[PDB]
mmCIF file of N, CA, C and O and ligand atoms in Angstrom:
data_model
loop_
_atom_site.group_PDB
_atom_site.id
_atom_site.type_symbol
_atom_site.label_atom_id
_atom_site.label_comp_id
_atom_site.label_asym_id
_atom_site.label_seq_id
_atom_site.Cartn_x
_atom_site.Cartn_y
_atom_site.Cartn_z
ATOM 1 N N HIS Y 1 -2.937 -12.084 9.185
ATOM 2 C CA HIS Y 1 -4.345 -12.258 9.591
ATOM 3 C C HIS Y 1 -5.374 -12.230 9.143
ATOM 4 O O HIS Y 1 -6.417 -12.237 8.419
ATOM 5 N N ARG Y 2 -5.472 -13.843 9.126
ATOM 6 C CA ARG Y 2 -6.728 -14.332 7.985
ATOM 7 C C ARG Y 2 -8.362 -14.153 8.737
ATOM 8 O O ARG Y 2 -8.822 -13.465 7.516
ATOM 9 N N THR Y 3 -8.507 -13.901 9.727
ATOM 10 C CA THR Y 3 -9.960 -12.877 10.351
ATOM 11 C C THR Y 3 -10.485 -12.044 9.858
ATOM 12 O O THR Y 3 -11.487 -11.492 10.397
ATOM 13 N N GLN Y 4 -8.902 -11.370 9.275
ATOM 14 C CA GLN Y 4 -9.777 -9.619 9.542
ATOM 15 C C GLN Y 4 -10.058 -9.564 7.768
ATOM 16 O O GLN Y 4 -9.687 -9.575 6.904
ATOM 17 N N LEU Y 5 -11.351 -8.632 7.903
ATOM 18 C CA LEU Y 5 -12.032 -7.745 6.308
ATOM 19 C C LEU Y 5 -11.065 -7.665 6.019
ATOM 20 O O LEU Y 5 -11.681 -7.186 4.447
ATOM 21 N N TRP Y 6 -9.920 -6.682 6.202
ATOM 22 C CA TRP Y 6 -9.091 -6.043 5.795
ATOM 23 C C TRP Y 6 -8.217 -6.983 4.870
ATOM 24 O O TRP Y 6 -7.236 -6.125 4.070
ATOM 25 N N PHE Y 7 -7.906 -7.750 5.186
ATOM 26 C CA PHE Y 7 -6.948 -8.820 4.928
ATOM 27 C C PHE Y 7 -7.391 -9.890 3.878
ATOM 28 O O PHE Y 7 -8.093 -10.700 3.653
ATOM 29 N N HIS Y 8 -6.642 -9.104 2.407
ATOM 30 C CA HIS Y 8 -7.087 -10.082 1.189
ATOM 31 C C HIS Y 8 -6.282 -11.060 0.866
ATOM 32 O O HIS Y 8 -6.209 -11.653 -0.548
ATOM 33 N N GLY Y 9 -5.072 -11.721 1.079
ATOM 34 C CA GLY Y 9 -4.500 -13.054 1.353
ATOM 35 C C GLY Y 9 -3.627 -12.694 -0.014
ATOM 36 O O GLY Y 9 -2.999 -11.224 -0.423
ATOM 37 N N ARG Y 10 -3.412 -13.169 -1.204
ATOM 38 C CA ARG Y 10 -2.092 -13.516 -2.029
ATOM 39 C C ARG Y 10 -2.974 -12.704 -3.565
ATOM 40 O O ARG Y 10 -3.843 -13.344 -4.242
ATOM 41 N N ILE Y 11 -3.136 -11.719 -2.678
ATOM 42 C CA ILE Y 11 -3.736 -10.343 -4.443
ATOM 43 C C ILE Y 11 -2.713 -9.866 -5.324
ATOM 44 O O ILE Y 11 -1.958 -9.360 -4.052
ATOM 45 N N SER Y 12 -2.533 -9.125 -6.352
ATOM 46 C CA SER Y 12 -1.852 -8.725 -6.714
ATOM 47 C C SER Y 12 -1.827 -6.931 -6.118
ATOM 48 O O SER Y 12 -2.937 -6.817 -6.491
ATOM 49 N N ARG Y 13 -0.687 -6.091 -7.179
ATOM 50 C CA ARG Y 13 -1.187 -4.806 -6.836
ATOM 51 C C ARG Y 13 -2.064 -4.474 -7.961
ATOM 52 O O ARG Y 13 -2.300 -3.563 -7.729
ATOM 53 N N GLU Y 14 -1.962 -5.191 -8.737
ATOM 54 C CA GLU Y 14 -2.762 -4.520 -10.048
ATOM 55 C C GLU Y 14 -4.074 -4.717 -9.322
ATOM 56 O O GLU Y 14 -4.941 -4.082 -9.473
ATOM 57 N N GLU Y 15 -4.533 -5.631 -8.984
ATOM 58 C CA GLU Y 15 -6.059 -6.001 -8.266
ATOM 59 C C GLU Y 15 -6.573 -5.186 -6.952
ATOM 60 O O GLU Y 15 -6.860 -5.380 -7.379
ATOM 61 N N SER Y 16 -5.267 -5.230 -6.501
ATOM 62 C CA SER Y 16 -5.267 -4.580 -5.541
ATOM 63 C C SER Y 16 -6.287 -2.957 -5.815
ATOM 64 O O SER Y 16 -6.964 -1.985 -5.045
ATOM 65 N N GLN Y 17 -4.937 -2.366 -6.854
ATOM 66 C CA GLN Y 17 -5.907 -1.233 -6.756
ATOM 67 C C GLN Y 17 -7.084 -0.842 -7.566
ATOM 68 O O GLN Y 17 -7.811 -0.051 -7.927
ATOM 69 N N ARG Y 18 -7.282 -2.001 -8.798
ATOM 70 C CA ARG Y 18 -8.423 -2.368 -9.130
ATOM 71 C C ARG Y 18 -10.040 -1.859 -7.891
ATOM 72 O O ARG Y 18 -10.512 -2.030 -8.835
ATOM 73 N N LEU Y 19 -9.412 -2.864 -6.985
ATOM 74 C CA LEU Y 19 -10.476 -3.051 -5.863
ATOM 75 C C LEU Y 19 -11.034 -1.817 -5.016
ATOM 76 O O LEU Y 19 -12.101 -0.885 -5.342
ATOM 77 N N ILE Y 20 -9.864 -1.148 -5.400
ATOM 78 C CA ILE Y 20 -9.737 0.562 -4.315
ATOM 79 C C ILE Y 20 -10.515 0.938 -5.992
ATOM 80 O O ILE Y 20 -11.526 2.094 -5.007
ATOM 81 N N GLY Y 21 -10.240 1.132 -6.999
ATOM 82 C CA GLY Y 21 -10.972 2.076 -8.132
ATOM 83 C C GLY Y 21 -12.603 1.787 -8.254
ATOM 84 O O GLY Y 21 -13.215 2.799 -8.141
ATOM 85 N N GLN Y 22 -12.734 0.653 -8.012
ATOM 86 C CA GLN Y 22 -14.067 0.291 -8.356
ATOM 87 C C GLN Y 22 -14.875 0.944 -6.897
ATOM 88 O O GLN Y 22 -16.106 0.385 -6.872
ATOM 89 N N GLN Y 23 -13.980 1.145 -6.079
ATOM 90 C CA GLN Y 23 -15.264 1.252 -4.820
ATOM 91 C C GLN Y 23 -14.675 2.744 -4.770
ATOM 92 O O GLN Y 23 -15.233 3.542 -3.468
ATOM 93 N N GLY Y 24 -14.209 3.615 -5.512
ATOM 94 C CA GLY Y 24 -14.980 5.246 -5.622
ATOM 95 C C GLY Y 24 -13.824 5.913 -5.621
ATOM 96 O O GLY Y 24 -12.939 6.503 -5.231
ATOM 97 N N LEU Y 25 -12.121 4.962 -4.814
ATOM 98 C CA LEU Y 25 -11.295 6.127 -4.500
ATOM 99 C C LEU Y 25 -11.249 6.806 -4.245
ATOM 100 O O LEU Y 25 -10.515 7.665 -3.914
ATOM 101 N N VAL Y 26 -12.164 6.427 -2.884
ATOM 102 C CA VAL Y 26 -12.571 6.904 -1.787
ATOM 103 C C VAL Y 26 -11.046 6.868 -0.661
ATOM 104 O O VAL Y 26 -10.329 5.594 -0.567
ATOM 105 N N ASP Y 27 -11.345 8.607 -0.006
ATOM 106 C CA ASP Y 27 -10.002 8.446 0.582
ATOM 107 C C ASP Y 27 -10.112 8.041 1.804
ATOM 108 O O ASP Y 27 -11.243 7.903 2.594
ATOM 109 N N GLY Y 28 -8.719 7.075 1.898
ATOM 110 C CA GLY Y 28 -8.468 6.049 3.336
ATOM 111 C C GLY Y 28 -8.992 5.181 3.248
ATOM 112 O O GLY Y 28 -8.865 3.800 4.449
ATOM 113 N N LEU Y 29 -9.492 4.464 2.126
ATOM 114 C CA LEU Y 29 -10.009 3.128 1.911
ATOM 115 C C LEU Y 29 -8.544 1.944 1.887
ATOM 116 O O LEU Y 29 -7.106 2.891 1.247
ATOM 117 N N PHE Y 30 -8.787 1.138 2.141
ATOM 118 C CA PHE Y 30 -7.309 0.976 2.828
ATOM 119 C C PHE Y 30 -7.744 -0.999 2.628
ATOM 120 O O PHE Y 30 -8.904 -1.515 2.820
ATOM 121 N N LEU Y 31 -6.464 -2.057 2.460
ATOM 122 C CA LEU Y 31 -6.218 -3.147 2.628
ATOM 123 C C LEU Y 31 -5.153 -3.180 2.647
ATOM 124 O O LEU Y 31 -3.903 -2.408 1.857
ATOM 125 N N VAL Y 32 -5.211 -4.672 3.185
ATOM 126 C CA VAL Y 32 -3.346 -5.454 3.516
ATOM 127 C C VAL Y 32 -3.375 -6.500 2.487
ATOM 128 O O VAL Y 32 -4.703 -7.310 2.109
ATOM 129 N N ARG Y 33 -2.036 -6.497 2.310
ATOM 130 C CA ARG Y 33 -2.058 -7.970 1.275
ATOM 131 C C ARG Y 33 -0.303 -8.645 1.495
ATOM 132 O O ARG Y 33 0.136 -8.158 1.988
ATOM 133 N N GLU Y 34 -0.470 -10.373 1.091
ATOM 134 C CA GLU Y 34 0.956 -10.754 1.316
ATOM 135 C C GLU Y 34 1.171 -10.212 -0.232
ATOM 136 O O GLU Y 34 0.991 -9.019 -0.951
ATOM 137 N N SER Y 35 3.075 -10.135 0.420
ATOM 138 C CA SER Y 35 4.359 -9.032 -0.617
ATOM 139 C C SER Y 35 4.697 -10.511 -1.407
ATOM 140 O O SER Y 35 4.998 -11.165 -0.797
ATOM 141 N N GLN Y 36 4.743 -10.383 -2.363
ATOM 142 C CA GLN Y 36 5.520 -11.175 -3.495
ATOM 143 C C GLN Y 36 6.944 -11.472 -3.222
ATOM 144 O O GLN Y 36 7.814 -12.489 -3.607
ATOM 145 N N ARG Y 37 7.416 -9.684 -3.913
ATOM 146 C CA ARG Y 37 8.244 -9.642 -3.624
ATOM 147 C C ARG Y 37 8.924 -9.741 -1.922
ATOM 148 O O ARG Y 37 10.375 -10.424 -2.411
ATOM 149 N N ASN Y 38 8.544 -9.400 -1.308
ATOM 150 C CA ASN Y 38 9.471 -9.992 0.039
ATOM 151 C C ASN Y 38 8.473 -10.756 0.837
ATOM 152 O O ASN Y 38 7.597 -10.463 1.356
ATOM 153 N N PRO Y 39 8.642 -12.487 0.569
ATOM 154 C CA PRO Y 39 8.030 -13.338 0.691
ATOM 155 C C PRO Y 39 7.040 -13.248 1.872
ATOM 156 O O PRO Y 39 5.924 -14.134 2.170
ATOM 157 N N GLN Y 40 8.070 -12.764 3.295
ATOM 158 C CA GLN Y 40 7.627 -13.147 4.513
ATOM 159 C C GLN Y 40 7.362 -12.070 5.495
ATOM 160 O O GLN Y 40 6.914 -11.334 6.087
ATOM 161 N N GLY Y 41 6.769 -11.220 3.912
ATOM 162 C CA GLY Y 41 6.083 -9.479 4.729
ATOM 163 C C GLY Y 41 4.902 -9.031 4.130
ATOM 164 O O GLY Y 41 4.314 -10.178 2.882
ATOM 165 N N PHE Y 42 4.249 -7.709 4.137
ATOM 166 C CA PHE Y 42 3.147 -7.995 3.840
ATOM 167 C C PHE Y 42 3.116 -6.260 2.881
ATOM 168 O O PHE Y 42 4.118 -5.683 3.106
ATOM 169 N N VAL Y 43 1.757 -5.793 2.631
ATOM 170 C CA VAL Y 43 1.747 -4.298 1.672
ATOM 171 C C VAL Y 43 0.496 -4.415 1.858
ATOM 172 O O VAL Y 43 -0.561 -4.750 1.230
ATOM 173 N N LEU Y 44 0.631 -2.705 2.984
ATOM 174 C CA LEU Y 44 -0.819 -1.949 2.979
ATOM 175 C C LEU Y 44 -1.337 -0.873 1.879
ATOM 176 O O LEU Y 44 -0.101 -0.631 1.706
ATOM 177 N N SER Y 45 -1.742 -1.425 1.287
ATOM 178 C CA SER Y 45 -2.543 -0.187 0.133
ATOM 179 C C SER Y 45 -3.535 0.356 0.086
ATOM 180 O O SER Y 45 -4.624 0.176 0.991
ATOM 181 N N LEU Y 46 -3.339 1.549 0.663
ATOM 182 C CA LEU Y 46 -4.066 2.549 0.978
ATOM 183 C C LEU Y 46 -4.211 4.019 -0.135
ATOM 184 O O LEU Y 46 -3.438 4.296 -0.858
ATOM 185 N N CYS Y 47 -5.867 4.477 -0.372
ATOM 186 C CA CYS Y 47 -6.377 5.846 -1.321
ATOM 187 C C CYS Y 47 -6.064 6.814 -0.427
ATOM 188 O O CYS Y 47 -6.644 7.295 0.255
ATOM 189 N N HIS Y 48 -5.481 7.910 -1.128
ATOM 190 C CA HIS Y 48 -4.707 9.466 -0.788
ATOM 191 C C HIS Y 48 -5.240 9.940 -1.673
ATOM 192 O O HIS Y 48 -4.202 9.808 -2.640
ATOM 193 N N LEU Y 49 -6.143 10.926 -2.027
ATOM 194 C CA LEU Y 49 -5.686 12.183 -3.541
ATOM 195 C C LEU Y 49 -5.961 10.831 -4.397
ATOM 196 O O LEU Y 49 -5.216 11.602 -5.357
ATOM 197 N N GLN Y 50 -7.013 9.900 -4.323
ATOM 198 C CA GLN Y 50 -7.643 9.747 -5.728
ATOM 199 C C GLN Y 50 -6.009 8.851 -6.778
ATOM 200 O O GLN Y 50 -5.528 9.099 -7.354
ATOM 201 N N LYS Y 51 -5.141 8.495 -5.515
ATOM 202 C CA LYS Y 51 -4.051 7.105 -5.837
ATOM 203 C C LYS Y 51 -4.244 6.333 -4.803
ATOM 204 O O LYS Y 51 -4.643 6.694 -3.457
ATOM 205 N N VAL Y 52 -3.353 5.473 -5.268
ATOM 206 C CA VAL Y 52 -3.378 4.721 -4.310
ATOM 207 C C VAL Y 52 -1.924 4.051 -4.175
ATOM 208 O O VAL Y 52 -1.008 3.816 -4.721
ATOM 209 N N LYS Y 53 -1.628 4.441 -2.603
ATOM 210 C CA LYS Y 53 -0.062 4.360 -2.184
ATOM 211 C C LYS Y 53 -0.037 2.838 -1.632
ATOM 212 O O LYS Y 53 -0.578 2.465 -1.007
ATOM 213 N N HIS Y 54 1.097 2.149 -1.562
ATOM 214 C CA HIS Y 54 1.852 1.718 -1.120
ATOM 215 C C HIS Y 54 2.451 0.865 0.092
ATOM 216 O O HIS Y 54 3.986 0.978 -0.605
ATOM 217 N N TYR Y 55 3.126 0.347 0.635
ATOM 218 C CA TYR Y 55 3.228 0.284 1.682
ATOM 219 C C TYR Y 55 3.978 -0.429 1.923
ATOM 220 O O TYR Y 55 3.321 -2.024 2.758
ATOM 221 N N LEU Y 56 5.273 -1.351 2.304
ATOM 222 C CA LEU Y 56 5.781 -2.515 2.565
ATOM 223 C C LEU Y 56 5.660 -3.235 4.255
ATOM 224 O O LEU Y 56 6.632 -2.149 4.880
ATOM 225 N N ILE Y 57 5.334 -3.946 3.922
ATOM 226 C CA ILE Y 57 5.641 -4.024 5.751
ATOM 227 C C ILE Y 57 6.044 -5.271 5.626
ATOM 228 O O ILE Y 57 6.413 -6.512 5.530
ATOM 229 N N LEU Y 58 7.490 -5.058 6.381
ATOM 230 C CA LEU Y 58 8.644 -5.696 6.876
ATOM 231 C C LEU Y 58 8.842 -6.603 8.073
ATOM 232 O O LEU Y 58 8.712 -6.048 9.020
ATOM 233 N N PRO Y 59 9.096 -8.369 8.196
ATOM 234 C CA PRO Y 59 9.028 -8.756 9.151
ATOM 235 C C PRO Y 59 10.859 -8.599 9.695
ATOM 236 O O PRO Y 59 11.327 -8.553 8.816
ATOM 237 N N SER Y 60 10.852 -8.612 10.869
ATOM 238 C CA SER Y 60 12.141 -8.174 11.651
ATOM 239 C C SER Y 60 12.419 -8.639 13.226
ATOM 240 O O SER Y 60 11.295 -9.361 13.694
ATOM 241 N N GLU Y 61 13.645 -9.074 13.743
ATOM 242 C CA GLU Y 61 13.936 -9.595 15.141
ATOM 243 C C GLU Y 61 14.320 -8.652 15.486
ATOM 244 O O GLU Y 61 15.731 -8.595 15.736
ATOM 245 N N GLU Y 62 13.998 -9.195 16.711
ATOM 246 C CA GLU Y 62 14.332 -8.920 18.375
ATOM 247 C C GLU Y 62 15.103 -9.108 19.340
ATOM 248 O O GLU Y 62 14.020 -9.500 19.788
ATOM 249 N N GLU Y 63 15.896 -9.022 20.202
ATOM 250 C CA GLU Y 63 16.628 -10.990 20.951
ATOM 251 C C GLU Y 63 15.802 -11.407 20.321
ATOM 252 O O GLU Y 63 15.399 -12.081 21.591
ATOM 253 N N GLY Y 64 15.761 -12.241 19.303
ATOM 254 C CA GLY Y 64 15.153 -13.087 18.795
ATOM 255 C C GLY Y 64 13.520 -12.838 18.202
ATOM 256 O O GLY Y 64 13.126 -13.768 17.807
ATOM 257 N N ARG Y 65 13.245 -12.447 19.050
ATOM 258 C CA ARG Y 65 11.082 -11.789 19.290
ATOM 259 C C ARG Y 65 10.769 -11.163 17.688
ATOM 260 O O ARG Y 65 11.469 -10.069 17.301
ATOM 261 N N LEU Y 66 9.946 -11.972 17.336
ATOM 262 C CA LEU Y 66 9.412 -11.396 15.620
ATOM 263 C C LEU Y 66 8.795 -9.888 15.924
ATOM 264 O O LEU Y 66 8.092 -9.821 16.625
ATOM 265 N N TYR Y 67 8.897 -8.742 15.357
ATOM 266 C CA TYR Y 67 8.217 -7.482 15.015
ATOM 267 C C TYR Y 67 7.625 -7.351 13.714
ATOM 268 O O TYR Y 67 8.434 -7.666 13.017
ATOM 269 N N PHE Y 68 7.010 -6.594 13.957
ATOM 270 C CA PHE Y 68 6.317 -5.615 12.380
ATOM 271 C C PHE Y 68 6.289 -4.133 11.705
ATOM 272 O O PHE Y 68 6.621 -3.546 12.968
ATOM 273 N N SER Y 69 7.366 -3.674 10.756
ATOM 274 C CA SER Y 69 7.383 -2.417 10.610
ATOM 275 C C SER Y 69 7.608 -2.004 9.645
ATOM 276 O O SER Y 69 8.083 -2.662 8.736
ATOM 277 N N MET Y 70 7.196 -0.770 9.177
ATOM 278 C CA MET Y 70 7.054 0.100 7.643
ATOM 279 C C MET Y 70 8.051 0.802 7.568
ATOM 280 O O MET Y 70 8.772 1.486 6.809
ATOM 281 N N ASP Y 71 8.398 1.545 8.788
ATOM 282 C CA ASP Y 71 10.038 2.513 9.004
ATOM 283 C C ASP Y 71 11.320 1.809 9.439
ATOM 284 O O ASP Y 71 11.315 2.969 10.492
ATOM 285 N N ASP Y 72 11.494 0.843 9.085
ATOM 286 C CA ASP Y 72 13.126 -0.204 9.319
ATOM 287 C C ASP Y 72 13.497 0.337 10.693
ATOM 288 O O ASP Y 72 14.401 0.596 11.015
ATOM 289 N N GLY Y 73 12.477 -0.733 11.763
ATOM 290 C CA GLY Y 73 12.513 -0.618 12.955
ATOM 291 C C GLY Y 73 12.083 0.555 14.122
ATOM 292 O O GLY Y 73 11.607 0.277 15.020
ATOM 293 N N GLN Y 74 12.316 1.930 12.821
ATOM 294 C CA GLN Y 74 11.349 3.139 13.717
ATOM 295 C C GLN Y 74 10.209 2.529 14.901
ATOM 296 O O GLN Y 74 9.893 3.197 16.056
ATOM 297 N N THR Y 75 8.719 1.660 14.660
ATOM 298 C CA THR Y 75 7.553 1.866 15.185
ATOM 299 C C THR Y 75 7.162 0.423 14.940
ATOM 300 O O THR Y 75 7.627 0.068 13.719
ATOM 301 N N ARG Y 76 7.272 0.188 16.257
ATOM 302 C CA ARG Y 76 7.112 -1.865 15.786
ATOM 303 C C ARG Y 76 5.749 -2.547 16.486
ATOM 304 O O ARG Y 76 5.201 -1.857 17.430
ATOM 305 N N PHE Y 77 5.570 -3.252 15.475
ATOM 306 C CA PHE Y 77 4.533 -3.994 16.033
ATOM 307 C C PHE Y 77 4.254 -5.844 15.837
ATOM 308 O O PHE Y 77 5.376 -6.272 15.148
ATOM 309 N N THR Y 78 3.767 -6.384 17.002
ATOM 310 C CA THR Y 78 3.730 -7.479 17.036
ATOM 311 C C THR Y 78 2.782 -8.091 15.762
ATOM 312 O O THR Y 78 3.671 -8.977 15.676
ATOM 313 N N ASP Y 79 2.233 -7.704 15.819
ATOM 314 C CA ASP Y 79 1.285 -8.510 14.127
ATOM 315 C C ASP Y 79 0.892 -6.912 13.686
ATOM 316 O O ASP Y 79 0.363 -6.147 13.867
ATOM 317 N N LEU Y 80 -0.081 -7.732 12.221
ATOM 318 C CA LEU Y 80 -0.433 -7.185 11.163
ATOM 319 C C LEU Y 80 -1.694 -6.098 12.165
ATOM 320 O O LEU Y 80 -2.032 -5.177 11.635
ATOM 321 N N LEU Y 81 -2.644 -6.592 13.105
ATOM 322 C CA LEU Y 81 -4.179 -6.266 13.663
ATOM 323 C C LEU Y 81 -3.550 -5.039 14.503
ATOM 324 O O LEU Y 81 -4.176 -4.447 14.566
ATOM 325 N N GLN Y 82 -2.244 -5.124 15.146
ATOM 326 C CA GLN Y 82 -1.823 -3.953 15.517
ATOM 327 C C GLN Y 82 -1.081 -3.068 14.910
ATOM 328 O O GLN Y 82 -1.905 -1.676 15.658
ATOM 329 N N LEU Y 83 -0.864 -3.461 13.938
ATOM 330 C CA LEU Y 83 -0.223 -1.757 12.675
ATOM 331 C C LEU Y 83 -1.481 -1.297 12.548
ATOM 332 O O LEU Y 83 -1.515 0.043 12.501
ATOM 333 N N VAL Y 84 -2.845 -2.045 11.842
ATOM 334 C CA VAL Y 84 -3.860 -1.606 11.468
ATOM 335 C C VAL Y 84 -4.540 -0.828 12.402
ATOM 336 O O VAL Y 84 -4.915 0.485 11.701
ATOM 337 N N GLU Y 85 -4.640 -1.441 13.899
ATOM 338 C CA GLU Y 85 -5.643 -0.739 14.915
ATOM 339 C C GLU Y 85 -4.962 0.615 15.234
ATOM 340 O O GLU Y 85 -5.453 1.640 15.038
ATOM 341 N N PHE Y 86 -3.334 0.508 15.051
ATOM 342 C CA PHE Y 86 -2.656 1.909 15.235
ATOM 343 C C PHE Y 86 -2.728 2.649 14.335
ATOM 344 O O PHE Y 86 -3.418 4.154 14.787
ATOM 345 N N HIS Y 87 -2.988 2.392 13.276
ATOM 346 C CA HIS Y 87 -3.003 3.291 12.122
ATOM 347 C C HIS Y 87 -4.454 3.939 11.760
ATOM 348 O O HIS Y 87 -4.694 4.684 11.010
ATOM 349 N N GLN Y 88 -5.441 3.684 12.595
ATOM 350 C CA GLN Y 88 -6.858 3.815 12.768
ATOM 351 C C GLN Y 88 -7.050 5.210 13.504
ATOM 352 O O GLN Y 88 -8.270 5.789 12.875
ATOM 353 N N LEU Y 89 -5.960 5.583 14.074
ATOM 354 C CA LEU Y 89 -5.925 6.695 15.091
ATOM 355 C C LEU Y 89 -4.675 7.470 14.453
ATOM 356 O O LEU Y 89 -4.945 8.882 15.218
ATOM 357 N N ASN Y 90 -3.825 6.835 14.501
ATOM 358 C CA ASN Y 90 -2.335 7.683 14.515
ATOM 359 C C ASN Y 90 -1.508 7.283 13.226
ATOM 360 O O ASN Y 90 -1.731 6.395 12.534
ATOM 361 N N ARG Y 91 -1.555 8.911 12.143
ATOM 362 C CA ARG Y 91 -0.731 9.061 10.892
ATOM 363 C C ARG Y 91 0.300 8.016 10.924
ATOM 364 O O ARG Y 91 0.847 7.137 10.026
ATOM 365 N N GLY Y 92 1.376 8.093 11.599
ATOM 366 C CA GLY Y 92 2.698 8.148 11.856
ATOM 367 C C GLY Y 92 3.512 7.932 10.764
ATOM 368 O O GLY Y 92 2.983 9.802 10.398
ATOM 369 N N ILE Y 93 3.720 7.706 9.483
ATOM 370 C CA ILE Y 93 4.108 7.595 8.377
ATOM 371 C C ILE Y 93 3.433 7.888 6.808
ATOM 372 O O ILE Y 93 3.481 8.283 6.075
ATOM 373 N N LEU Y 94 1.984 7.898 7.432
ATOM 374 C CA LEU Y 94 0.900 7.191 6.531
ATOM 375 C C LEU Y 94 1.047 8.603 6.051
ATOM 376 O O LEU Y 94 0.358 9.777 6.781
ATOM 377 N N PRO Y 95 0.088 9.218 4.996
ATOM 378 C CA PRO Y 95 -0.882 10.880 4.673
ATOM 379 C C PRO Y 95 -1.567 10.944 5.200
ATOM 380 O O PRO Y 95 -2.698 12.431 5.304
ATOM 381 N N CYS Y 96 -2.704 9.979 5.353
ATOM 382 C CA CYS Y 96 -4.202 9.824 6.292
ATOM 383 C C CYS Y 96 -4.265 8.684 7.086
ATOM 384 O O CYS Y 96 -2.994 7.324 6.658
ATOM 385 N N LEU Y 97 -5.352 8.300 7.594
ATOM 386 C CA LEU Y 97 -5.798 7.348 8.600
ATOM 387 C C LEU Y 97 -6.168 6.561 7.696
ATOM 388 O O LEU Y 97 -7.014 6.393 6.558
ATOM 389 N N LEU Y 98 -6.364 5.287 8.291
ATOM 390 C CA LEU Y 98 -7.147 3.674 7.341
ATOM 391 C C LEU Y 98 -8.110 4.104 8.126
ATOM 392 O O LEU Y 98 -8.604 4.110 9.223
ATOM 393 N N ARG Y 99 -8.997 4.800 7.218
ATOM 394 C CA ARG Y 99 -10.832 5.098 7.288
ATOM 395 C C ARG Y 99 -11.708 4.140 6.873
ATOM 396 O O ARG Y 99 -12.743 3.869 7.399
ATOM 397 N N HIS Y 100 -11.082 3.385 6.136
ATOM 398 C CA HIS Y 100 -12.714 2.334 5.152
ATOM 399 C C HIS Y 100 -12.164 1.494 5.027
ATOM 400 O O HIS Y 100 -11.302 0.651 4.172
ATOM 401 N N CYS Y 101 -12.413 -0.594 5.019
ATOM 402 C CA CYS Y 101 -12.455 -1.418 5.007
ATOM 403 C C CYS Y 101 -12.516 -1.714 3.415
ATOM 404 O O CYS Y 101 -13.916 -1.847 3.592
ATOM 405 N N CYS Y 102 -11.340 -2.290 2.613
ATOM 406 C CA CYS Y 102 -11.805 -2.409 1.657
ATOM 407 C C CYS Y 102 -12.495 -3.835 1.368
ATOM 408 O O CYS Y 102 -11.927 -4.865 1.720
ATOM 409 N N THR Y 103 -13.879 -4.418 1.111
ATOM 410 C CA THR Y 103 -14.763 -5.105 0.646
ATOM 411 C C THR Y 103 -13.620 -6.523 0.149
ATOM 412 O O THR Y 103 -13.019 -6.245 -0.608
ATOM 413 N N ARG Y 104 -13.284 -7.743 0.985
ATOM 414 C CA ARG Y 104 -12.763 -8.722 0.626
ATOM 415 C C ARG Y 104 -13.888 -9.416 -0.589
ATOM 416 O O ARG Y 104 -13.252 -10.021 -1.002
ATOM 417 N N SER K 1 11.457 5.514 0.636
ATOM 418 C CA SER K 1 12.978 4.553 0.874
ATOM 419 C C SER K 1 13.120 2.554 1.009
ATOM 420 O O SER K 1 14.217 2.148 1.163
ATOM 421 N N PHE K 2 11.885 1.828 0.612
ATOM 422 C CA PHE K 2 12.023 0.988 -0.008
ATOM 423 C C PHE K 2 11.381 0.651 -1.365
ATOM 424 O O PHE K 2 10.482 1.449 -1.650
ATOM 425 N N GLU K 3 12.616 0.187 -2.743
ATOM 426 C CA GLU K 3 12.281 0.961 -4.274
ATOM 427 C C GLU K 3 10.618 -0.063 -4.576
ATOM 428 O O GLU K 3 10.526 -1.411 -3.885
ATOM 429 N N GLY K 4 10.217 0.468 -5.227
ATOM 430 C CA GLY K 4 8.325 0.068 -5.471
ATOM 431 C C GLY K 4 7.923 -0.119 -4.196
ATOM 432 O O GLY K 4 6.384 -0.310 -4.669
ATOM 433 N N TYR K 5 8.034 1.040 -3.390
ATOM 434 C CA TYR K 5 7.359 1.117 -2.332
ATOM 435 C C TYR K 5 6.951 3.137 -1.945
ATOM 436 O O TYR K 5 7.641 4.145 -2.446
ATOM 437 N N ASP K 6 6.093 3.056 -1.498
ATOM 438 C CA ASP K 6 5.647 4.418 -0.934
ATOM 439 C C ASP K 6 6.104 4.757 0.933
ATOM 440 O O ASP K 6 5.763 6.182 1.063
ATOM 441 N N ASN K 7 6.637 3.915 1.417
ATOM 442 C CA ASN K 7 7.101 3.811 2.776
ATOM 443 C C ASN K 7 8.037 5.505 2.654
ATOM 444 O O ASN K 7 9.118 5.257 2.211
ATOM 445 N N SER K 8 7.778 5.832 3.450
ATOM 446 C CA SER K 8 9.077 7.352 3.568
ATOM 447 C C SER K 8 9.553 8.145 2.497
ATOM 448 O O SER K 8 10.308 8.567 2.513
HETATM 449 NA NA1 NA X 201 5.643 1.791 11.265
#
């Protein structure tokens, strides 16, 4: 999702941790970025209890149709935006809500 | 759940 403020593109895990740290390690601070290790997937970086958690977002296919998921298909999303919007109100597998957008 | 990530 190119036009989203929480989307930082192809940056590293180290760099996302630095940005979050620089922003106060505030609980609920988050960003999404591309995954190098999982080429057409993403990583949600989320700050909770002064640590930075990293959640893998994998593409997959149902009846040919593409969806994203962090929990091996238990909870499925059309695109990154829906995943992010859902988790601003619902924890799901996350330890907390996505509360603050890390500045890109 | 996935090596090197915090999912579940
Ligand atoms: Na999910």
